[model samples]
Target: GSSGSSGDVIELTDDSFDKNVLDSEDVWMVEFYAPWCGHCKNLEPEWAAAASEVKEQTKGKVKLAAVDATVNQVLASRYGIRGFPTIKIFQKGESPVDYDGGRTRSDIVSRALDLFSDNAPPPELLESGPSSG
Candidate 1:
């Protein structure tokens, strides 16, 4: 029974993943992490900050979603998530690209902005997470 909770960084479960992420028409930056992971604990605040700022910047066109690796093992394993934290960027139901950015408000936001803009790839490279905060 989930009650009231955090707003911006949306939570995606195993069942809800397809509808919100794949089926929807939006740019998504999804983080796969385990609750007990120390690194994930460290990354949470930066993720939330980026999520909040990105929401305002894109008016919900860009989404930062989180999936608990331990709980959503089906989704995790589907993405081959073998580490504590893995960021994958998805666009318009196409294949996803790994987010190669450091965990910071600017870094995360920067990568997301690139995704929101590019929206298509031959997958051009962007500056990798310049601010390693």
Candidate 2:
């Protein structure tokens, strides 16, 4: 069974977001949502439940974080988050894998593996490359 070893949910702000998601060496799943949005509001409880489930399953292998879209508009735009409950998977310093439909814990876990190549990739993938520009 999947069991989280540490706290499940991490409230990320515009200030600490980079440290938790980009600067960290671990894989991270970030959720972008707004408080005023009905869908986001509705998803909150379910999201928390799923977070706990995933945390236990991954046992800290992956970090789950959330950001308030209202205050973190810049970060949301950076990830092209156009809707509530947008999900982004981050690995090392590479481009975040933009994914949708990860409303469940298993969904998140599956996509993370799919995008990360079984949680491991070639060193070349981490080497510097031309900017997205």
Candidate 3:
């Protein structure tokens, strides 16, 4: 029932897929995968950590979600998921972009930051410690 073991990666399905990703203003990075996928299993932890970091940095302006392609065939067909663990990015009025870059936490986080920067207005800087002398 959960997208992941952790709370960061959103569990998306055919029922909520459109409402959560397509009909929203936020940029979404989604992984289309099957439960028995080897690659999906490999990227699971990395995706979870990156999602947590990305959520903090983007302040929820960007989102990370996953779809079980096996269970959610309708959603998978819409995206043309040919592979077991295909990663795609969805933004309003734009075609989904396949993710073929690094799979590490830092790589995923960096790519997400880039997408957030390009798609949306600059992130409002949060107040920090006092300025140095």
Ordered from best to worst TM-score, the candidate numbers read 3, 1, 2
lDDT winner between 1 and 2, please give it: 1
**Candidate 3 Cα outliers beyond 4 Å, as residue runs:** 1-7, 123-133
lDDT of 2 by residue, 50-127 (tens): 566655555555667777887887787776676888877777856667767756665765655454444544335475
The true-versus-predicted C-alpha distance at residue 24 of model 2, in Å, is 1.5
As a whole number from 0 to 100, the lDDT of residue 48 in candidate 2 is 67
After the best TM-score superposition of candidate 1, give how far the Cα of residue 13 lies from its true spot, in angstroms: 0.9
- Please write out the lDDT profile of model 3 over residues 1-133, one tens digit for every residue: 3553574888887888888887798998888777887878888888888888998888887788877888888877876887867788888987878898787678988989988888756857755558832
TM-score of each model, in listed order: 0.80, 0.71, 0.82
Superposition-based RMSD of candidate 3 using all C-alpha atoms, in angstroms: 6.6
Residue 117's lDDT within candidate 1 is 56
Q: What is the model-wide C-alpha lDDT for candidate 3?
A: 0.81
